From a paper:
CD4+ T cells recognize a broad range of peptide epitopes of severe acute respiratory syndrome coronavirus 2 (SARS-CoV-2), which contribute to immune memory and limit COVID-19 disease. Analyzing six epitopes, some with very low binding affinity, we solve X-ray crystallographic structures of each bound to HLA-DR1. In summary, each peptide bound HLA-DR1 canonically in the “forward” orientation that is described for HLA-DR,48 excluding CLIP. We observed little deviation in the overall structure of HLA-DR1 irrespective of bound peptide, particularly within the peptide binding groove, where the solved diversity of bound peptides had little impact on the position of the HLA-DR1 residues that lined each pocket.
Studies using peptides encompassing S511–530 have identified the region to contain a potential CD4+ T cell epitope in cohorts of individuals recovered from COVID-19 (3%–22% of individuals responded). We have recently isolated CD4+ T cell clones reactive to S511–530 and confirmed HLA-DR1 restriction via activation to HLA-matched allogeneic lymphoblastoid cell lines (LCLs). S511–530 was designated a weak binder (IC50 = 2,624 nM). The structure of HLA-DR1-S511–530 was solved to 1.4 Å resolution in space group P 65 2 2. With a defined core of VVLSFELLHAPATVCGPKKS, S511–530 best satisfied the HLA-DR1 binding motif within all presented peptide-HLA-DR1 complexes, where P1-Phe, P4-Leu, and P6-Ala are all the most enriched amino acids at these positions within both the EL and the BA motif. At P9, P9-Thr is enriched in the BA motif but not EL data. The presence of Cys11 in the C-terminal PFR did not affect refold or crystallization ability, and additional density indicating thiol capping was not present as observed in HLA-DR1-S486–505. Within the core epitope, S511–530 exhibits diverse physicochemical properties at TCR-facing positions: acidic P2-Glu, a short aliphatic P6-Ala, P7-Pro and P8-Ala stretch, and the basic P5-His, which shrouded over P3-Leu to form a central charge within the epitope core. HLA-DR1-S511–530 presented a “best fit,” deviating only by Thr incorporation at P9. Despite this, S511–530 was in fact a weak binding peptide in vitro.
Author numbering:
A (entry chain A): 1 to 182
B (entry chain C): 2 to 15
C (entry chain B): -1 to 190
């Protein structure tokens, strides 16, 4: 029975950050999210926007309700704050690595809350800032979150990489190492 | 094309 | 800003549409989560809201006093779940992407001692797949280990399925992949 499917509309609002999110998930993959700054629908695969539509203005009104409801719930709980749950991190590649053949490093950050995280790729100890892309926070059934960050790269046996993750639940930055061996 | 639809969030009780 | 350790407060709303046998059976679960605790839920098998924790009791009571909200939620299996299933079916439910299959040894070791042969199955969708190893046509199971199914985040999956071998000259190892994207199995051989 993989003859079952699940579609989830998942939203959040987080204070004091004033951060909202609105996304749809199908069987664990994001269909789309609403970019809260640009106020637009971002399809996870670009071609989905040729096959379907979505009206982001209604999603943004839901975020206004979610913010008001968070404020009510925060008071109703007597200002009980969230307990931080730190992430676990795995680095892998899109496909088996071959010397100088383009690939993608994937930093997968999982099982954390609240949904605020600072993720930096390091190559030979130094931050690699551009070329990277990242997903929004994806929901889990335990109401924690997961997230993917991607770095296209040319494999070399001399370079080493680290995905450096900072989160309130961690006592120090988590550095997940990756390198290509001969 | 067809449009995905959302469910709207109700206001919690004050 | 540096040194931001202010307490945080989180609210999540999740609407889950569960589909059984196409859209023959549909269940909606609407969940409210404060911090990491679900407080109230609407389950279409119940048809009204129910408190999950005491924090949610006021909302279950208030929402259950609203005829309009309840009628809208009771019809949502059709107006929302089945609707959205129909919108997305052709590119989600029906999405099929064929994997690329490669085989390689895990390290360079001499014949007649232990090695791990790797069958890499890359880039497929949906996640249901069968990856099996054969030695001279006979299936090997005891020495097989895998990464498990890896979701790449981009609507593809991958997996490595590995076989611990003591390869002898002349032996042929085959990795066979069955997957809904192909009508015949994919096979890749490695000759010792």
């Amino acid at each position: 029975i993989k003859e079952e499917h699940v579609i989830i509309q998942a939203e959040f609002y987080l204070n004091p950050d004033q951060s909202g999110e609105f996304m749809f998930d199908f069987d664990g993959d994001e269909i789309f999210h609403v970019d809260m700054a640009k106020k637009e629908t971002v399809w996870r695969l670009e071609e989905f926007g040729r096959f379907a539509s979505f009206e982001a203005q209604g999603a943004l009104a839901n975020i206004a309700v979610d913010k008001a409801n968070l404020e009510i719930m925060t008071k109703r709980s007597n200002y009980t704050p969230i307990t931080n749950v730190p992430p676990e991190v795995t680095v892998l590649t899109n496909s088996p690595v071959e010397l100088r053949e383009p690939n993608v490093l994937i930093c997968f950050i999982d099982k954390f809350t609240p949904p605020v995280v600072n993720v930096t790729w390091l190559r030979n100890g130094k931050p690699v800032t551009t070329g990277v892309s990242e997903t929004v926070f994806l929901p889990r059934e335990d109401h924690l979150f997961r997230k993917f960050h991607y770095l296209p790269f040319l494999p070399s046996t001399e370079d080493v990489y680290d995905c450096r993750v900072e989160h309130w639940g961690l006592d120090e930055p988590l550095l997940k190492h990756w390198e290509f061996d001969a | 094309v067809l449009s995905f639809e959302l469910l709207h969030a109700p206001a919690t009780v004050c | 800003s540096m040194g931001d350790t202010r307490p945080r407060f989180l609210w999540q709303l999740k609407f889950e549409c569960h589909f059984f046998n196409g859209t023959e059976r549909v269940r909606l679960l609407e969940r409210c989560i404060y911090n990491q605790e679900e407080s109230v839920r609407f389950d279409s098998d119940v048809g009204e809201y129910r408190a999950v924790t005491e924090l949610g009791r006021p909302d279950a009571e208030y929402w259950n006093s609203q005829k309009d909200l309840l009628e809208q939620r009771r019809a949502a299996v059709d107006t929302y779940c089945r609707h959205n299933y129909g919108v997305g079916e052709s590119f989600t439910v029906q999405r099929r992407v064929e994997p690329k299959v490669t085989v390689y040894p895990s390290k360079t070791q001499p014949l007649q001692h232990h090695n791990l042969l790797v069958c890499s199955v890359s880039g497929f969708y949906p996640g249901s797949i069968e990856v099996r190893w054969f030695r001279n046509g006979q299936e090997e199971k005891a020495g097989v280990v895998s990464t498990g199914l890896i979701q790449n985040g981009d609507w593809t999956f991958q997996t490595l399925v590995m076989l611990e071998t003591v390869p002898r000259s002349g032996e042929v190892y085959t990795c066979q992949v069955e997957h809904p994207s192909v009508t015949s199995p994919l096979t890749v051989e490695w000759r010792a």
